[PDB]
Amino acid sequence: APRKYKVYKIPKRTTGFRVIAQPAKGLKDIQRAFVQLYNFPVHDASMAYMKGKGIRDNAAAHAGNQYLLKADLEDFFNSITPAIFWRCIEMSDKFFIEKILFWQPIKHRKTKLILSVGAPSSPVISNFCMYEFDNRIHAACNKLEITYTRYADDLTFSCNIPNVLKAVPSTIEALLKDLFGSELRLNHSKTVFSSKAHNRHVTGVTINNEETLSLGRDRKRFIKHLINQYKYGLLDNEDKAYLTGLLAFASHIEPGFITRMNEKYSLELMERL
DNA sequence: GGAAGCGAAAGTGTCGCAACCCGAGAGAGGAACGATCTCGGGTTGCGACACTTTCGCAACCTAATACGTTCA
């Protein structure tokens, strides 16, 4: 149900906590069944929370560009409400859909209905809400030779032609106010411009100055200190599993790094882990 | 959304301090009746605070889960 959620805190990698609301099991299954019953329109540029297309593809969409820009939607999930969903459906019996889809974080606000990050159905509705937003933004971008993707609160644009992304921020805002009234809003504090002169990266994947995806020198040094420790067996159980997971991540994003690590010490060492 | 306590921002009220008036009063200095100089109550102005009010920061999480990573 809308109130059938459980709230908790998960910490942050630097300081502070984040508040999550995982649904109950029965409504979890009900919303999964609803997701299966009707598939929602989704734009290709939304390379997040879909089969196959992962972080690597979203970051590689901008590999072959030298000027990078992006903005972060302010309070993405919690802004979506019944009105946004139904306007999106109309633009292209219904009360139980409202009940199943949404969350009520306040005991008194029966109408304060929003998507939670925990909800397994939240990704599908989030992608569905911006089907025309992505349509128009990508149409404009490709009209001006701009590659645009969105990793779920990370609207990324890239291009090679100088002084074109400058108008893109404003564009975004305008379109937003046409589509979702004035409810969902951008985060002007996070908007970042970068070039081949600074530290570009999309969704955590670094983009080096040679138009290839990379783990970044930071990690490439961190999980090689970890490997040098494993060489002398100075890790632990959880730490060793952490190194294994990080090596798997580096294999997925930058297989060349794994090959070079193998050449560094051996093949059997990484088969062991 | 927001408790508990605290403080910012703003607005209104208090209240010394000053300015000024208006009678009194001993008595110029020489001519009587007394200019001037003061001693007081008392009223009004006038701005520096002092108090009153509202806003807004952000604690908390009967309903989870519990191989390791990444990423919203």
UniProtKB/Swiss-Prot annotation:
It comes from Escherichia coli. PROSITE patterns: RT_POL. Mg(2+) binds at D72, D153, D154. It is an enzyme of class 2 (transferase). It holds the Pfam family RVT_1. Its EC number is 2.7.7.49. It catalyses: DNA(n) + a 2'-deoxyribonucleoside 5'-triphosphate = DNA(n+1) + diphosphate. Residues 1-207 form the Reverse transcriptase domain. Keywords: Antiviral defense, Magnesium, Metal-binding, Nucleotidyltransferase, RNA-binding, RNA-directed DNA polymerase, Transferase. PANTHER family: NUCLEAR INTRON MATURASE 1, MITOCHONDRIAL-RELATED, RNA-DIRECTED DNA POLYMERASE. The keyword Transferase applies. GO terms for biological process: defense response to virus. This is Retron Ec78 reverse transcriptase. GO terms for molecular function: metal ion binding; RNA binding; RNA-directed DNA polymerase activity. Belongs to the bacterial reverse transcriptase family. InterPro entries: DNA/RNA_pol_sf (IPR043502), GrpII_Intron_Splice-Mob/Def (IPR051083), Reverse_transcriptase_msDNA (IPR000123), RT_dom (IPR000477). Reverse transcriptase (RT) component of antiviral defense system retron Ec78, composed of a non-coding RNA (ncRNA), this reverse transcriptase (RT), a probable ATPase and a putative HNH endonuclease. Expression of retron Ec78 confers protection against bacteriophage T5. At multiplicity of infection (MOI) of 0.02 cultures slow growth when infected with T5 but do not collapse, at MOI 2 cultures enter growth stasis. Responsible for synthesis of msDNA-Ec78 (a linear ssDNA with a 5'-terminal phosphate residue). Unlike most known msDNAs the mature product does not have an RNA component. The keyword Ribonucleoprotein does not apply. The lineage of its organism: Bacteria, Pseudomonadati, Pseudomonadota, Gammaproteobacteria, Enterobacterales.
